[PDB]
Each structure stands twice: as structure tokens, then as C-alpha cells.
């Protein structure tokens, strides 16, 4: 399908950026996770980034490590994650859905079979966090064969060769990394990404979303002014789940207020 392309075309007409929350599928449980995701969408999420619980998420800091653990404590499996993805797409026909995967879960029962299953449930993109462009060939080939956008990372230390490869190989959106390190709201990016954003546009790369450490509305607006097409926020969202485990009503209310404020920041 064309869900990212249609989204960014609509966003450009409204002269606004995308706000894309991340959560772990099945955190803190399957049905509470489904309600959380509906609340993110009703509050204004333009797209979703969704993590499949993995035993050893080496690109994630403590906040999202604990989200993975909570999902495992609820017994959440990748098979149940695909069931959830089907239910989400059934309710929301146009929202772009990207998965955050670790390589072993994609490789486990066959790379091609993994992307075929993504296509069957209506996923739009896949980011494999521990597969650099140097190792990406069988993943990106299988993705494209199944109409899945392969999401590549543009890090702050990117040279010109990497910019050209990510621009050529990627689809859907380019992931513009805010900083080195692992996921987490406590650590905000330091460098300005203006030069990379404009090289990406020169090479006709997929529109850029900035992520890692985006926890406040100002950061969303700043990413859009810098030229990026939008911003991703994970740990800031997941912290609201963690803080409100004992109160699912106050959890959804505080998620709604936060997403609404982050999205409003993308409008100017």
C-alpha cells in the first residue's frame, strides 16, 4: 500500500509535521495495549511505531526495557502481536503502522515469511534495529517483495556514502537519529541535524522523522522547523503507562493529553 506516501502528502498540504508515538505491543497487557493504541490515534497520532517484545532489546534504555518485560509478564508472544496488528488495522484503515523489530525475530522462522506475515496483517514498514545497511540486503529485498517499507537509520555521524545509501534503499520514511546511545526520555539530542536533513532531501530520500529523546512539544516543533517531516516519541509515552499501571483510566487520560499536546506542536 501507500499509507506513508499518502500521509506525508496530506501533511504537506496542511503544512504540518507528523507526530508518531511508539509503544510496546502488549504492554501492560494485550487488551490494555489495544485501548492505549486507540487512545494514541484518537488523540491525533499520525502514524504508529510498534515494538514486538524481545528478550534482549539492545537499542533500548530502561524505560522501554521494562515495557518489554511487562509484555512478557503478560505472556505476549510475536504470534499474539500479529493478532493485535490485525485488530488495529481492522479499526484504522489508513494509519501508517511501522514495526520496531530486532533481527532474530525477523530471521527466526525465515525472513521472507516474516515480511509476508507483515503484509498479510496490514503493516506498512519495518525497522530492524540491529541490522545496519551493511547487513540489510535480504531484509530490504524481502520487505519490498511484500510491499513493506524498509526503514533505515540516518545517524548523526553519517557520512555522504551512508546518506546516499539510505536515500536509495529506504521507503516510507527515513529515521533521523537525534543522538548516539539508546532510547530514553532522560537524554536529549545535542547536535543540529540541519545538514543531514537537507542532504537527504537532495538525494530524494523518504521523508525524515526524528527520534530518540523526543519528550516535549518544543522538540517536536524544533524538528519540523529544522526541515524534518516529523518526530517519534517512545519513552515519554511508555513512562505514562508505567506511572499509571494501577489506574488504567488515568493512564489513558494522561496519554491523551500528552499526545494531543505533542501533535499540536507539529502544526507550527
Amino acid at each position: 500500500m501507500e499509507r506513508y506516501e499518502n500521509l506525508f502528502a496530506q501533511l504537506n498540504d496542511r503544512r504540518e509535521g507528523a507526530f508518531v508515538p511508539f509503544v510496546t505491543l502488549g504492554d501492560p497487557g494485550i487488551e490494555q495495549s489495544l485501548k492505549i493504541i486507540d487512545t494514541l490515534i484518537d488523540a491525533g497520532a499520525d502514524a504508529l511505531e510498534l515494538g514486538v517484545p524481545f528478550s534482549d532489546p539492545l537499542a533500548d534504555g530502561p524505560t522501554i526495557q521494562n515495557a518489554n518485560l511487562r509484555a512478557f509478564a503478560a505472556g505476549v508472544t510475536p504470534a499474539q502481536c500479529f493478532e493485535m496488528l490485525a485488530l488495529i488495522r481492522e479499526k484504522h484503515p489508513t494509519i501508517p503502522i511501522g514495526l520496531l523489530m530486532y533481527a532474530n525475530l525477523v530471521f527466526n522462522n525465515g525472513i521472507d515469511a516474516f515480511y509476508a506475515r507483515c503484509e498479510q496483517v496490514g503493516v506498512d514498514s519495518v525497522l530492524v534495529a540491529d541490522v545496519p545497511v551493511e547487513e540489510s540486503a535480504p531484509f530490504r529485498q524481502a520487505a519490498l517483495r511484500h510491499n513493506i517499507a524498509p526503514i533505515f537509520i540516518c545517524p548523526p555521524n553519517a557520512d555522504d556514502d551512508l546518506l546516499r545509501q539510505v536515500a536509495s534503499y529506504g521507503r516510507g520514511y527515513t529515521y533521523l537519529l537525534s543522538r548516539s546511545g539508546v532510547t530514553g526520555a532522560e537524554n536529549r539530542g545535542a547536535l543540529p541535524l540541519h545538514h543531514l536533513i537537507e542532504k537527504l532531501k537532495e538525494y530524494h530520500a523518504a521523508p525524515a522523522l526524528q527520534g530518540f529523546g523526543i519528550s516535549s512539544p518544543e522538540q517536536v516543533s524544533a524538528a519540523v522547523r529544522a526541515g524534518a517531516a516529523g518526530a517519534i516519541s517512545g519513552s515519554a509515552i511508555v513512562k505514562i503507562i508505567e506511572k499509571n499501571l494501577a489506574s488504567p483510566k488515568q493512564m489513558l487520560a494522561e496519554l491523551r493529553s500528552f499526545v494531543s499536546a505533542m501533535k499540536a506542536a507539529s502544526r507550527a
Binding site: 539492545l58 525475530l105 540491529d130 547487513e135 545517524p155 546511545g181
Partner: protein, 395 residues
């Protein structure tokens, strides 16, 4: 793009987040440059000889083979400064860290032997060293937590997951992905993303080179087989490397069988796991049917790791090297036997290699065979753990 081949057949590669690829490429380039640099080689040789104590002895173990046709030599890496083979490649990697202008060292440890080695090399060479160690291993290998902190290293207990070596590896890599401009990750085994399996082999290969020269001097011929335990792969590939092209020489690696392979509580992915992608490499993994990485188990903290370096997976696949397992109880017997009959207290890791050699002898006592066991470390760190076990047995 790399200078060297990152794969051994289908195994290996660089499965790290994109952010870390410049660090790996820088490390590869520094290694290739240093391997051509006579000044680096001389510094490295100087440290190995005059600081670490190389060459290490090759001891002929006569009492424990009495009444059989097995001749058994032990390559005495237990006599290396620090007490284990880990010191060899730490000295080379520390020199690489300095060559790249790094001022800090990150290291994981389970047996604490690599932690101690990283700490002593950092104290000598002027690096600020921080060690990640699983909280379970902090306890069962505590004599080394004492050593590391005396030498100025920061030791960080890891309570996540199994609170053992795998979890320390995870946090070391997480840390490196946010500190690589100033910190070198001194990975402690022949595993992980390229170029570590290659670098660690080349910086351990003197074990086998010395062994070969020593066996030739004493016996006039090559060994029938060399035998080493396999936690991540470094002491075994260090012993194996110089014999790989000597096709008559058996290469036997010993994985931990833990409570028994059939219990699932073991550390034997090469023979009882299946290929997966984790810790920066494509390699045999202990994993669930779903592709979650399992937790391993071994009495020996240094072998308690649910994967294995890619060159061992390759050497196995083509039949050049053979891999077996040894249970906790088999390792404990070999530990006791070496203490009592050769006066050498071995690391419990190394005791797995010894146990398999003793099995080779006992199973076929009239088979003529010349065997070398890599005695990868001394057992001082294990004496308390072994005490509590034999006490609970009434021994």
C-alpha cells in the same frame, strides 16, 4: 564496506545498530594498521613477555594418566599474569584503544577474569576502566570483584535478566553505543560483531603457536588433539588457530553441559542451539521456538553464555573441529582430580576441557594418544564455590 571478511561461512557479520558501524570500522582499520606496524608488534611482544610472563609452560601430567596410553600436556595459561588467558588479548586491545585515542575502556565479565585483565591493563596503560558484571557472578566469582576495584576499575553490577554474563554483555554494548567516541569496548571473547572474532583470535594465537613449538620440542611430533573449553570462544580459538592447517590434529571444543543437555540448563548452543542473530553476530543461539534468546546455565560463570563465536560454528560446520559437552559434575571431578594428583588448581571453565580429555583416556585406555588441554585459568576464584558444593555433598 570492510577491509576484512566479516563472515566465517554463514556465521558472523556486524549486526549492530547503525550508530556503531563507524566504531567497528575504526577498530578494524586500527587493527589492520597495527598488524603491519613493527612498533606496535614490539610493544605488544614486550608486554606479553616482560609483564604477563609469556611463554607459558607446557606441563606433562603424568599421575592422572597412569596405567593408560594417553600422554597429556596442559598449556599453562593459569600462570599468566592475572591468572587466565584473557590477559593476552586485553594487552593487544588496550594498545589498540590507545592507538585510536580512546581514554576509557568498557568491558563485560562473567568469570571476572576478563574484568581483572581489563582492569590491570587499564591501570598499566592509563585508561579509565568500567566493568559490567552480572550480580549472580559478582557473588560466585567474588575474589575477582575485589581484584578489579583495587586496580581502580569501576565495577557495575547488572541485575537484569539472568544477572549473569549475557546480561553484562547487553549493558556493555548499550553503554558503548552512547560513549564510543571516548570509550573502547574491550570485548572479552572471540564473538560479537566483526572485527572482534578476528581480532581476538589473532591476539590469542600465541597459545597454539607456543604449544606447537613446545610439543615438537618434547615429543618430536604434533598432538593427536588439542582440547579447550568454549564459553564465547577465545581460549579455544587461541589454541586452535595455529593447528587449523595441520589436518591430522584434532580440534576439540568443550561446551558446558550444565545440569545435563536434556534438562535445557546448559550452555551448549553450538551443538544444541540453532542459528540466530544476537550480540552483533549470526551464530548458534540458545533460543525459544519464538526466537527469544534463552538464558544459559553452567556451574562455571565463564561458560554461562547462550551463544558462541562464529569461527567455531564454521569450523564445526565443515567438520574441521569437533564440539562436545561436559556437565557440572564431570567438571567438578576433573577439578578435584587435578588438585589432588597434579597439584594444580584449575578454573572451573578449564576443568570442562580437562574432564573431556580424561574421558577420552578412560573410555579407551589402550588407545595411544598425545593430547593437549588448554588450562585456560587458575581456580582461586572458584575455591569458595567448590567448597560450598562439596560441603553440601558431605565430602
Amino acid at each position: 564496506t570492510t577491509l576484512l571478511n566479516p563472515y566465517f561461512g554463514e556465521f558472523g557479520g556486524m549486526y549492530v545498530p547503525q550508530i556503531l558501524m563507524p566504531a567497528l570500522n575504526q577498530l578494524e582499520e586500527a587493527f589492520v594498521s597495527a598488524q603491519k606496524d613493527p612498533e606496535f608488534q614490539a610493544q605488544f611482544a614486550d608486554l606479553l613477555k616482560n609483564y604477563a610472563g609469556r611463554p607459558t609452560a607446557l606441563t606433562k601430567c603424568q599421575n592422572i594418566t597412569a596405567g593408560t596410553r594417553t600422554t597429556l600436556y596442559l598449556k599453562r595459561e593459569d600462570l599468566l599474569h592475572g591468572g587466565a588467558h584473557k590477559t593476552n588479548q586485553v594487552l593487544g586491545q588496550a594498545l589498540l584503544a590507545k592507538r585510536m585515542g580512546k581514554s576509557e575502556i568498557i568491558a563485560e565479565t562473567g568469570a571476572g577474569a576478563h574484568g581483572v585483565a581489563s582492569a590491570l591493563a587499564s591501570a598499566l596503560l592509563g585508561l579509565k576502566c568500567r566493568i559490567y558484571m552480572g550480580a549472580k557472578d559478582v557473588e560466585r566469582q567474588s575474589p575477582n570483584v575485589f581484584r578489579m576495584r583495587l586496580m581502580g576499575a569501576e565495577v557495575i553490577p547488572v541485575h537484569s535478566g539472568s544477572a549473569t554474563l549475557k546480561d553484562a554483555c547487553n549493558e556493555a554494548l548499550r553503554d558503548w553505543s552512547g560513549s564510543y567516541e571516548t570509550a573502547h569496548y574491550m570485548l572479552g571473547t572471540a564473538a560479537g560483531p566483526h572485527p572482534y572474532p578476528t581480532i581476538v583470535r589473532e591476539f590469542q594465537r600465541m597459545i597454539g603457536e607456543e604449544t606447537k613449538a613446545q610439543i615438537l620440542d618434547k615429543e618430536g611430533r604434533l598432538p593427536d588433539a588439542v582440547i579447550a573449553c568454549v564459553g564465547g570462544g577465545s581460549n579455544a580459538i587461541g589454541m586452535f588457530a595455529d593447528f587449523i592447517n595441520d589436518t591430522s590434529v584434532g580440534l576439540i571444543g568443550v561446551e558446558p553441559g550444565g545440569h545435563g543437555i536434556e534438562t535445557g540448563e546448559h550452555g551448549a548452543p553450538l551443538k544444541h542451539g540453532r542459528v540466530g542473530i544476537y550480540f552483533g553476530m549470526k551464530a548458534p543461539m540458545m533460543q525459544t521456538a519464538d526466537g527469544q534468546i534463552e538464558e544459559s546455565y553452567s556451574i562455571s560463570a565463564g561458560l554461562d553464555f547462550p551463544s558462541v563465536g562464529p569461527q567455531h560454528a564454521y569450523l564445526n560446520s565443515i567438520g574441521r573441529a569437533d564440539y562436545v559437552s561436559i556437565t557440572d559434575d564431570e567438571a567438578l571431578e576433573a577439578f578435584k582430580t587435578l588438585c589432588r594428583h597434579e597439584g594444580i588448581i584449575p578454573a572451573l571453565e578449564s576443568s570442562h576441557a580437562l574432564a573431556h580429555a580424561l574421558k577420552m583416556m578412560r573410555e579407551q585406555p589402550e588407545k595411544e594418544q598425545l593430547l593437549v588441554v588448554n588450562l585456560s585459568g587458575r581456580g582461586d576464584k572458584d575455591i569458595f564455590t567448590v567448597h560450598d558444593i562439596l560441603k553440601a555433598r558431605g565430602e
